[PDB]
DNA sequence: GATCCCAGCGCG
DNA sequence: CAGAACTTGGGGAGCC
DNA sequence: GGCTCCCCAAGT
DNA sequence: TCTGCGCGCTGGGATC
């Protein structure tokens, strides 16, 4: 009572509170759908309460959070739950305003995660409820297929695709993908709320195995157990996909009672796998799927001018089949466009606007709807357009979307860092200098040894020295202008100016009860992206600090550990790495292989186009001398005699025929302007034919090692000037 | 103290509170710029407080609002203001935590409106403060022009354009339009906060004339005085624009002290005029400028599939120079796409999604970002694409944007109504039936008399009877199924089902202290868009209701008054109308004139294209017979002899030359595929040439009255089937 | 020695 | 993702 | 007989 | 227009 979002039932806390089944719904769309279904089901015994998204993990959080969490307190009040109270008897159950709890949400993985979090919360706080079938879920269809009047509902993508791949005609039906609850109309809620048999599963507790499964899924202690469990699941899925064995979808016709064991080990695990795919990047290009979609859309659009972040995000959502949320796209844009100190070393997207500074580490950026960006010319250098003809593209809803992974010239993952936070894994890879990497890979090309490389950050004046394997020390710049004055001119990585100031200066300037005052005053001269602290203190205290160490006193040093080199290899698998050299070698091997493939593809395409140009030259020369006559000629006879004259059909188009497989057409010669009959056009066409004839041999006489050199040479050719322009303005 | 958004000065309520100048800035962007300038100006004497948008009009509101208004209470606490306290002495001034108040906002009209509202507040509550120069404004430049190193700042559009039209080369400078405060970077705030002399004006009180001006601007009593004041200003502006006399911008070099009189009568009046343009629609097409921009962008895009509302709104903002706000575009889309009962009779944009129902009158619509729409085929019928060649298009920032006003076949304003709330005027025009209007205009075309017409609403089962000039009665449908049971099957216009139910049934079902219970029970059977109330009551009470009148008792009748027919005529002037017939006659006259113009334009274009086709036929016929030879021929000599042979250059392009004014080119007779030398293409070209030769005469033998007939015939031809499809599904 | 809290990012 | 004030004028219903 | 409050829409 | 919680893992700094 008194909670604004309470669409409670009539019998709330009444005589029949054991029959009042509150519906838990994440989202206002789900709340509206429940309200629409209330007309069918009535408001006497059903109450509606929305959720805020994802809930706190009580087993993983502190008691202070539990007390201070609004949503847990609200649900406890509404159900009538009591702290530490045991509910293993019906007399205590009568104290609750509601009898049963029903959960319903999207059919995607995040909904399963929400069910899992609710299960964990209930089991941790009041496990005995599970013994009485306290929880049920309202499933909703995810796919609807239409044929005339017949409508088929599919609750699982696997069974839906099984049905789809067993139809005489896919076009005989229209398929609608219900990837949410806002898509469903209020009218469909009538059908949803008219069928409890098809839309109600009950969480039937089995035994201690369910408790063990929940603990495995949610106890922070069993992280490594989660790692091995996910690895076993991944291996099983790999075996299934390499053997073609279909899996057993849980949403069966007779499926009405579900154990927590199957829910945890069958669908929440699918969410864990999806989260791992979302978060942990790929070794091949260092792009999480969201970033890959962003870049694929930016390439397809090929925008030549400024575009608003929201507009580009909407374009990404529409032409790349992104189905998670637009604000995530806005965050991805603002992350990939950041270029200040400690952020991305290479800014693929130009930050035309307030994208954040060292003051807050990108948390002070302007709103993402008044900031523009455009493709920096560097990115196209990293991913040559010609290379795209080899990438294995994907299909979502029978639409052409992003490839599995892009292919750059330089290993992108070890350039701009990687901060991925999966489930059962993680990834924290620092930055490196681009020129050092390109020199190392050029040396590797020549057969020399790869020089060991140390992490570096763009325009980072501080020095980093390795103190051990995957163990480095980051240190700022401290100077002593005069005997009782010091200057800070550099800060460690991930040490924002505002946070460092507020956490260091005044906590130590005036001090606390535990630590007295140290310094007297400080003056800051902060430029756009540089820190200049001038601190004056008592002479003796600065002498003590020098005795104690200037870096040690001011906390201008920090430890960086990189014991979590976990990436996705070329063949789509999770792999933990040890040092940079292994990743560099793997990238080198794959890049050589794709140079082999692209040389073959380029030589084939160039041969086909040279053949086409030679045919065009032959035909125009025949026309000039009058050997060919088409004036007032029938199309069929003309085509027949051209075939008999020794002309081949569409070599360029015929070239694409060999690509996809693994009457005759002469439009290309015939779709030519009459200007071609002028001598200047003839000379120009002959010139182009000869140029292509030279160029095909020039390329076929090269080697894959040769072509990489100009890739790096061109990449570095204008890398300096833009970086010079990055400093010439400043 | 304790207000979260307070960046107060150090001396807040201290010894020198008379020197603490709080800054009032609407927008978090303006707050951020103020914070950036705080570094230059120091936080000792300056405090920062942001606005919430637009503030309450204290002179026009009740005391309950004043007590319950968060903005006013917060600002009163921050300044230390006291109710009913007089501040006409320095001793009372020292009770205030702040000495001066500075106002800073955008340079557009809304900023002037915010200054006006603040002035009204201060004058109404504590006028004596104005006698002591209590208020000052911080102006910011609106246009920045760049040339190499020189930068010029312009604070007023008039002076900026005066400078612009007096330059040897506009491209010698780059112009940036600072149409906001988020555009300005923090670095520019340094320059802004370094120059008070150029960015500080003080509100110097003059006398009772200032008080009279404020009262005129803000007192609800002087609405008519505002009407005549605005009319006089409009007449003066018309005289100036017809005589070319420039106006005197107050943003002068020596301008440092400003009187409230000038502020009211030279800028805030401009905001009133702009609001009038925004709100009061146009006579010709009933589109406010926002709706016109939406339709212009929708036509240019010519989207053939569903598009998200947010995506289309962003497209509007970028390709139509809209510079107000995206949420306004979302509201405009959701308004123009609405099609339920009582809403738009004609839905130009198909509402593909939950756009709202009769339950809440469009206030229950889904999220503006989860809903799609696309151009209904009907709209293109109203605005034929060929007609667009006559509209006078506009230019913003030297970019091609929407025209002044579109020409439809039917008068659009009297079709979907008009609900505009301007300043000093208003407009409320109800709906009408399309078929009735088209029949009336067809009769007007034949010289007959225009039948008087009554307002009608699409699918509105209720009946409307006129009770006087601009005075109508709207009545629902109530029946008596049995002697003690009634059924309501229709509600008056603008009477939403939920609002009517909550305001009628339960205030009368159970009654109040003043009125006891009347009915016993009610059951509703509400379909998608129909109301079905079945009410059972005591027999004697229903007998009394029949004695008192069934419509009267249930409030199923309402009065509609249309004494505010105020529109914008073709010449862009405000005009108050009396009845529908005058508007119809004006639209009829302008539409006949534009048919005359379009007939002339079409005959000219058709003649030019027929000439071009005849030239192409002559050339190809010459080529077939060999009279013309171009094989291996020089371009220059070929062009010369073609000129001498009697061929003219680009008649279609030459046709456009005459349009814009109020060497020879032969690509069109040369840019054809070699298929043109085949006999089939020759026969086809002859067929088109002859068809155009027939068609030009067929059109030139018609009359403007004729061409309208098929416009209406085609419009009605498929008007029924879509309306039939609107009901066939239901 | 040991526990606790927080900052990094694509998501609900 | 969602929910939150005000403007500006006409006119209609509902209280005293 | 009269004052008061609210709904309508493109904007802060 | 803005502003508000939680996730999931690693590891580092502070506090006891
Ligand atoms: C908090 O920060 C600022 C707020 C504002 C106001 C504002 C102010 C409000 C308020 C709401 C609004 C809101 O308008 C609302 O938008 C909604 C957008 O979605 C649709 C569904 O419905 C719209 C509402 O019909 C409209 O009323 C803002 C949108 O555009 C604005 O200009 C509005 O309710 C409380 O007071 C201005 C600023 O600087 C100029 C700010 O910095
Ligand atoms: C109110 O209605 C609902 C809210 C939500 C949550 C949510 C919940 C919150 C909360 C915040 C949020 C918020 O996340 C924030 O997004 C921001 C988007 O712009 C940028 C600038 O910054 C992002 C924040 O980094 C992130 O924290 C929502 C955005 O997308 C969501 O899914 C979020 O703070 C309090 O609790 C889910 C629902 O159903 C699934 C709802 O019905
Ligand atoms: Mg979902
Ligand atoms: Mg503005």
**Burial (Cβ within 10 Å: 0-12, 13-18, ≥19) of residue A660:** exposed
A559 Cβ neighbours under 8 A, 6+ residues apart:
A467, A471, A472, A473, A474
B171 to B129, B146, B164: CA distances (angstroms): 49, 10, 11
Could you give the 3-state DSSP secondary structure of residue B365?
A: coil
B78 to A378, B604, B692: CA distances (angstroms): 51, 70, 77
Tell me the ligand closest to B177's alpha carbon.
Answer: 4
Q: Chain B partners of A673 at a C-beta cutoff of 8 Å? A: 670-673
Distance B268 CA to ligand 3 centre (A): 49
Task: Give domain limits for chain B.
Answer: 17-140+202-270, 141-177, 280-430+567-572, 471-561, 588-705
> Are the CB atoms for B479 and B486 separated by under 8 Å?
yes
The DSSP symbol for A348 reads S
Nearest alpha carbon to residue A346 among A302, A409, A422: A409
CA A510 to chain centre: 45
User: Is any atom of nucleic acid chain E found less than 7 Å from the CB of residue B324?
Assistant: yes
Pick the residue whose CA is nearest to atom 41 on ligand 1. B27
Per-residue H/E/C for A210-248:
HHHHHHHHHCHHHHHHHHHHHHHHHHHHHHHHHHCCCCC
Does domain A471-561 match CATH 3.30.1360.40?
Answer: yes
What is the CB neighbour count within 10 angstroms for residue B195? 10
Could you give the 3-state DSSP secondary structure of residue B634?
A: coil
Could you give the 3-state DSSP secondary structure of residue B523?
A: strand
> Are the CB atoms for B549 and B476 separated by under 8 Å?
no
Separation of first and last alpha carbons in chain A: 60
Both structure tokens of A522:
């400080």
Per-residue H/E/C for B438-504:
HHHHHHHHCCCCCCCCCCCCCCCCCEEEEEECCEEEEECEEEEEECCEEEEEECCCCCCHHHHHHHH
> Are the CB atoms for A355 and A337 separated by under 8 Å?
yes
Cα–Cα distance measured from residue B251 to residue B155, given in angstroms and rounded to the nearest whole number: 7
Both structure tokens of A106:
């999207």
The third-level CATH classification (topology) of the domain covering A280-430+566-578 is Topoisomerase II; domain 5 (3.90.199)
Q: Which of B83, B322, B370, B595 is catalytic?
A: B370
Way the structure was solved? cryo-EM
User: Is any atom of nucleic acid chain E found less than 7 Å from the CB of residue B26?
Assistant: yes
B474 to B456, B548, B551: CA distances (angstroms): 10, 18, 11
CATH value of B588-705 in 3.90.650.10, 1.10.268.10, 3.40.140.10, 3.40.50.460: 1.10.268.10
Indicate the angle between helix axes A223-243 and A269-279, nearest 10 degrees. 90
Q: Residue B46 pairs with which residues in a beta bridge?
A: B21
Q: Residue B583 pairs with which residues in a beta bridge?
A: none
**CATH class of the structural domain A589-704:** mainly alpha
> Are the CB atoms for B349 and B375 separated by under 8 Å?
yes
The DSSP symbol for A352 reads B
Residue carrying the six token digits 């020369």? A621
Conformational region of residue A632, where left means phi above 0, alpha means psi within -120 to 50, and beta covers everything else = left
B386 Cβ neighbours under 8 A, 6+ residues apart:
B598, B602
A237 to A9, A231, B179: CA distances (angstroms): 45, 10, 56
User: Is any atom of nucleic acid chain F found less than 7 Å from the CB of residue A422?
Assistant: yes
Tell me the ligand closest to A182's alpha carbon.
Answer: 3
The DSSP symbol for A209 reads H
Both structure tokens of B526:
């509400």
Does B368 contact ligand 1 (Cβ within 6 A)?
Answer: yes
Instruction: State chain B's maximal CA–CA distance in angstroms.
Output: 107
Residue B501: half-sphere exposure toward Cβ, Cα within 13 Å: 18
Q: Chain B partners of A185 at a C-beta cutoff of 8 Å? A: 354
Both structure tokens of B146:
């760049």
CA A280 to chain centre: 9
> Are the CB atoms for B92 and B85 separated by under 8 Å?
yes
Indicate the angle between helix axes A289-301 and A326-336, nearest 10 degrees. 80
Q: Which of A180, A314, A528 to mutate against chain B (most B CBs within 10 Å)?
A: A314
User: ∠ CA A353-A356-A359 to the nearest 5 degrees?
Assistant: 145
The reply to whether B637 touches chain A by the CB within 8 Å rule is no
A233 Cβ neighbours under 8 A, 6+ residues apart:
A269, A273
Structural Rg of chain A based on CA atoms: 33
Where is A332: in which H helix or E strand? helix A326-336
> Are the CB atoms for B179 and B110 separated by under 8 Å?
no
The reply to whether A576 touches chain B by the CB within 8 Å rule is no
Does A579 contact ligand 2 (Cβ within 6 A)?
Answer: no
Instruction: Kindly provide the b/e burial profile for residues A283-302, where b requires at least 16 CB atoms within 10 angstroms of the residue's own CB.
Output: bbbbbbbbbbbbbbbbbeee
Both structure tokens of A353:
């606007």
Both structure tokens of A702:
């090269």
> Are the CB atoms for A129 and A136 separated by under 8 Å?
no
Does A136 contact ligand 2 (Cβ within 6 A)?
Answer: no
CA B618 to chain centre: 52
A375 to A405, A521, A721, B447, B655: CA distances (angstroms): 19, 45, 17, 63, 41
Distance in Å, residue B591 CA to nucleotide D4 C1'? 46
The reply to whether B370 touches chain A by the CB within 8 Å rule is yes
The reply to whether B253 touches chain A by the CB within 8 Å rule is no
Structurally, what CATH architecture does the domain formed by B280-430+567-572 represent?
Answer: Alpha-Beta Complex (3.90)
What is the CB neighbour count within 10 angstroms for residue A572? 13
The DSSP symbol for A207 reads S
CA A379 to chain centre: 18
Both structure tokens of B573:
């002037």
Q: Which residues of A are catalytic?
A: 370
Beta carbon pairs, A and B, within 8 Å: 103
Cα–Cα distance measured from residue A583 to residue B403, given in angstroms and rounded to the nearest whole number: 59
Both structure tokens of A564:
């979590």
Could you give the 3-state DSSP secondary structure of residue B629?
A: coil
Handedness of CA B445, B448, B453, B456 (dihedral sign): negative
CA A389 to chain centre: 23
- DSSP strand pairing (A477-482 vs A485-490): antiparallel
Q: Which long-range contacts (CB under 8 A, 24 or more apart) does B349-358 make?
A: B349/B298, B349/B373, B349/B374, B349/B375, B349/B376, B349/B379, B350/B374, B350/B375, B350/B376, B352/B306, B354/A185, B354/A186, B357/B528, B357/B529, B358/B496, B358/B497, B358/B529, B358/B531
**CATH class of the structural domain B141-177:** alpha beta
User: Which of the nucleotides lies closest to A111 (Cα–C1')?
Assistant: C12
Resolution of this structure in Å: 3.9
Q: Residue B568 pairs with which residues in a beta bridge?
A: B282, B574
- DSSP strand pairing (B574-577 vs B565-568): antiparallel
CA-nearest residue to B354 within chain A is A185
Could you give the 3-state DSSP secondary structure of residue A208?
A: helix
Tell me the ligand closest to A111's alpha carbon.
Answer: 3
Q: Which of residues 2-41 of B touch A (CB under 8 A)?
A: 29, 32
Cα–Cα distance measured from residue B711 to residue B442, given in angstroms and rounded to the nearest whole number: 11
Distance A5 CA to ligand 3 centre (A): 21
Distance in Å, residue B332 CA to nucleotide E10 C1'? 8
Does domain A21-140+202-270 match CATH 3.40.50.670?
Answer: yes
Q: Residue B137 pairs with which residues in a beta bridge?
A: B103, B201
Phi and psi at residue B544, in whole multiples of 5°?
A: -60, -40
User: ∠ CA A96-A101-A102 to the nearest 5 degrees?
Assistant: 165
Distance in Å, residue A68 CA to nucleotide F5 C1'? 11
Cα–Cα distance measured from residue A622 to residue B632, given in angstroms and rounded to the nearest whole number: 11
- After which residues, if any, is chain A broken (C to N > 2.5 Å)? 662
B383 to B387, B400, B405, B431, B593: CA distances (angstroms): 7, 19, 11, 20, 16
**Burial (Cβ within 10 Å: 0-12, 13-18, ≥19) of residue B168:** exposed
The torsion of the CA quartet B214, B215, B220, B223, rounded to 10 degrees, works out to -90
CA-nearest residue to B312 within chain A is A311
Phi and psi at residue B537, in whole multiples of 5°?
A: -145, 180
Site to substitute for ligand 2 among A25, A26, A28, A52, most atoms within 8 A of C-beta: A52
User: Is any atom of nucleic acid chain D found less than 7 Å from the CB of residue B226?
Assistant: yes
Distance in Å, residue A420 CA to nucleotide C7 C1'? 13
Both structure tokens of A206:
């089995």
Both structure tokens of A503:
């956490």
The third-level CATH classification (topology) of the domain covering B17-140+202-270 is Rossmann fold (3.40.50)
User: ∠ CA B426-B428-B433 to the nearest 5 degrees?
Assistant: 155
The torsion of the CA quartet A89, A95, A97, A103, rounded to 10 degrees, works out to -30
Tell me the ligand closest to B29's alpha carbon.
Answer: 1
Q: Do B370 and A638 touch (CB under 8 A)?
A: no
Q: Chain A partners of B370 at a C-beta cutoff of 8 Å? A: 29, 182-183
> Are the CB atoms for B543 and B403 separated by under 8 Å?
no
The reply to whether B626 touches chain A by the CB within 8 Å rule is yes
- DSSP strand pairing (A143-147 vs A150-154): antiparallel
The reply to whether B671 touches chain A by the CB within 8 Å rule is yes
Where is B566: in which H helix or E strand? strand B565-568
Q: Chain A partners of B314 at a C-beta cutoff of 8 Å? A: 308, 310-311, 314
Task: Flag whether A106 is marked binding.
Answer: yes
> Are the CB atoms for A458 and A341 separated by under 8 Å?
yes
Where is B106: in which H helix or E strand? none
CA A704 to chain centre: 32
Distance in Å, residue B62 CA to nucleotide E12 C1'? 21
Separation of first and last alpha carbons in chain B: 60
Cα–Cα distance measured from residue A199 to residue A107, given in angstroms and rounded to the nearest whole number: 12
User: ∠ CA B616-B618-B624 to the nearest 5 degrees?
Assistant: 100
The DSSP symbol for B19 reads G
Both structure tokens of A651:
């070599």
Structural Rg of chain B based on CA atoms: 33
> Are the CB atoms for B619 and B669 separated by under 8 Å?
yes
The DSSP symbol for B521 reads E
Q: Chain A partners of B637 at a C-beta cutoff of 8 Å? A: none
| DSSP string for B162-178 | HHHTT-S-GGGSEEEE-
Does B576 contact ligand 1 (Cβ within 6 A)?
Answer: no
Hey, do A21-140+202-270 and A141-177 end up sharing a CATH topology, with the first three levels equal? no
Could you give the 3-state DSSP secondary structure of residue A103?
A: strand
The DSSP symbol for A566 reads E
Both structure tokens of B608:
């030019």
User: Is any atom of nucleic acid chain F found less than 7 Å from the CB of residue A560?
Assistant: yes
Q: Chain B partners of A623 at a C-beta cutoff of 8 Å? A: 631
Handedness of CA A642, A648, A652, A655 (dihedral sign): positive
The reply to whether B529 touches chain A by the CB within 8 Å rule is no
Residue carrying the six token digits 């354009």? B161
A38 to A33, A617, B360, B530, B606: CA distances (angstroms): 9, 76, 18, 19, 63
Does A367 contact ligand 2 (Cβ within 6 A)?
Answer: no
Nearest-neighbour CA in chain B from A256: distance (Å): 33
Per-residue H/E/C for A425-491:
CEEEECCCCHHHHHHHHHHHHCCCCCCCCCCCCCCCCCEEEEEECCEEEEECEEEEEECCEEEEEEC
Task: Flag whether B106 is marked binding.
Answer: yes
Alpha helices in A539-678 (DSSP H): 539-548, 550-554, 580-625, 635-645, 651-661, 667-670
**Burial (Cβ within 10 Å: 0-12, 13-18, ≥19) of residue A496:** buried
- DSSP strand pairing (B135-137 vs A46-51): unpaired
Residue carrying the six token digits 């995607």? A108
Nearest-neighbour CA in chain B from A125: distance (Å): 36
| DSSP string for A110-158 | HHHHHHHHHHHHHHHH-GGGGGGT-EEE----SEEEEETTEEEEES-HH
Nearest-neighbour CA in chain B from A635: distance (Å): 6
Alpha helices in B626-669 (DSSP H): 635-645, 651-661
What count of residues does chain B have?
730
Nearest alpha carbon to residue A319 among A228, A200, A259, A400: A400
- DSSP strand pairing (A485-490 vs A533-537): antiparallel
Both structure tokens of A47:
């109450």
**Which of B32, B183, B678 is closest, CB to CB, to A633?**
B678
Indicate the angle between helix axes B679-700 and B580-625, nearest 10 degrees. 150
Residue carrying the six token digits 């005795």? A547
> Are the CB atoms for A672 and A678 separated by under 8 Å?
no
**Which of B182, B318, B677 is closest, CB to CB, to A308?**
B318
Cα–Cα distance measured from residue A589 to residue A609, given in angstroms and rounded to the nearest whole number: 30
Task: Flag whether A224 is marked binding.
Answer: no
Cα–Cα distance measured from residue A194 to residue A216, given in angstroms and rounded to the nearest whole number: 37
User: Which of the nucleotides lies closest to B514 (Cα–C1')?
Assistant: D15
Q: Do A680 and B369 touch (CB under 8 A)?
A: no
Site to substitute for ligand 1 among B26, B53, B104, most atoms within 8 A of C-beta: B53
Residue carrying the six token digits 């899992």? A116
Q: Do A675 and B670 touch (CB under 8 A)?
A: yes
Indicate the angle between helix axes A109-125 and A269-279, nearest 10 degrees. 120
The DSSP symbol for B24 reads E
Could you give the 3-state DSSP secondary structure of residue A409?
A: coil
Residue carrying the six token digits 């809803």? A397
- DSSP strand pairing (B46-51 vs B21-26): parallel
Nearest alpha carbon to residue B349 among B386, B306, B388, B392: B306
């Amino acid at each position: 009572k008194g909670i604004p979002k309470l669409d409670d039932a009539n019998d709330a806390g009444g005589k029949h509170s054991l029959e009042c089944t509150l519906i838990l719904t994440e989202g206002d769309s789900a709340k509206s759908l429940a309200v629409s279904g209330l007309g069918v089901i009535g408001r006497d015994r059903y109450g509606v309460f929305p959720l805020r998204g994802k809930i706190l993990n009580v087993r993983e959080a502190s008691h202070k959070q539990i007390m201070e969490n609004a949503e847990i307190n609200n649900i406890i009040k509404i159900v009538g739950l009591q702290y530490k109270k045991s509910y293993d008897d019906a007399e205590s159950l009568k104290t609750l305003r509601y009898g049963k709890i029903m959960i319903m949400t999207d059919q995607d993985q995040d909904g399963s995660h929400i069910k899992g979090l609710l299960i964990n919360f209930i089991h941790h706080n009041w496990p005995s409820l599970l013994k009485h079938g306290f929880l049920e879920e309202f499933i909703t269809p995810i796919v609807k297929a239409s044929k005339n009047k017949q409508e088929l509902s599919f609750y699982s993508i696997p069974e839906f695709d099984e049905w789809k791949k067993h139809i005489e005609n896919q076009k005989a039906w229209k398929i609608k993908y219900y990837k949410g609850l806002g898509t469903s109309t209020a009218k469909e809620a009538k059908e949803y709320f008219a069928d409890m048999e098809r839309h109600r599963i009950l969480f039937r507790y089995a035994g201690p195995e369910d408790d063990a499964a929940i603990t495995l899924a949610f106890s922070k202690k069993k992280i490594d157990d989660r790692k091995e469990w996910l690895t076993n699941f991944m291996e099983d899925r790999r075996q299934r996909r390499l053997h073609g064995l279909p899996e057993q979808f849980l949403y069966g016709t007779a499926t009405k009672h579900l154990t927590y064991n199957d829910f945890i080990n069958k669908e929440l695990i699918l969410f864990s796998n999806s989260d791992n795919e979302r978060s942990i990047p790929s070794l091949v290009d260092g792009f999480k799927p969201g970033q890959r979609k962003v870049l694929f859309t930016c390439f397809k659009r090929n925008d030549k001018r400024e575009v608003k972040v929201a507009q580009l995000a909407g374009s990404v959502a529409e032409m790349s089949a992104y189905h998670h949320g637009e604000q995530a796209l806005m965050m991805t844009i603002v992350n990939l466009a950041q270029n200040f100190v400690g952020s991305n070393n290479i800014n693929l997207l130009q930050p035309i606007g307030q994208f954040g500074t060292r003051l807050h580490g990108g948390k002070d950026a302007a709103s993402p709807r008044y900031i523009f960006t455009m493709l920096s010319t560097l990115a196209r250098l990293l991913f040559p357009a010609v290379d795209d003809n080899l990438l294995k593209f994907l299909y979502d809803d029978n639409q052409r979307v992003e490839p599995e992974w892009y292919i750059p010239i330089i290993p992108m993952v070890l350039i701009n860092g990687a901060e991925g936070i999966g489930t059962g894994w993680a990834c924290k890879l620092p930055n490196y200098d681009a020129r050092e990497i390109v020199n190392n890979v050029r040396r590797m090309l020549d057969g020399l040894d790869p020089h060991p490389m140390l992490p570096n950050y763009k325009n980072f004046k501080g020095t980093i020295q390795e103190l051990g394997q995957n163990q480095y020390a980051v240190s700022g710049e401290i100077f002593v202008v005069d005997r009782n004055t010091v200057e800070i001119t550099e800060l460690p990585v991930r040490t924002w100016t505002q946070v460092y100031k507020e956490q260091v200066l005044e906590p130590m300037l005036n001090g606390t009860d535990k630590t007295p005052a140290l310094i007297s005053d400080y003056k800051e001269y902060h430029t756009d992206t540089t820190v200049k602290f001038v601190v004056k203190m008592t002479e003796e205290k600065l002498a003590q600090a020098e005795a104690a160490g200037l870096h040690k006193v001011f906390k201008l040093q920090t430890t960086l550990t990189c014991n979590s080199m976990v990436l996705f290899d070329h063949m789509g698998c999770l792999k933990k790495y040890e040092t940079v050299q292994d990743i560099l070698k793997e990238f080198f091997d794959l890049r050589l292989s794709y140079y082999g493939l692209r040389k073959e593809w380029l030589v084939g395409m160039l041969g086909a186009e040279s053949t086409k140009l030679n045919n065009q030259a032959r035909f125009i020369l025949e026309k000039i001398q009058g050997k060919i006559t088409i004036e007032n000629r029938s199309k069929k006879d003309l085509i027949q005699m051209l075939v008999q004259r020794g002309y081949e059909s569409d070599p360029v188009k015929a070239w694409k025929e060999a690509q996809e497989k693994a009457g005759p057409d002469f439009n290309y010669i015939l779709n030519m302007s009459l200007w071609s009959l002028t001598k200047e056009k003839v000379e120009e066409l002959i010139k182009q034919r000869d140029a292509k004839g030279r160029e095909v041999n020039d390329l076929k006489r090269k080697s894959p090692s040769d072509l990489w050199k100009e890739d790096l040479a061109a990449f570095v050719e204008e890398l300096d000037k833009v970086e010079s322009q990055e400093r010439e303005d400043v």
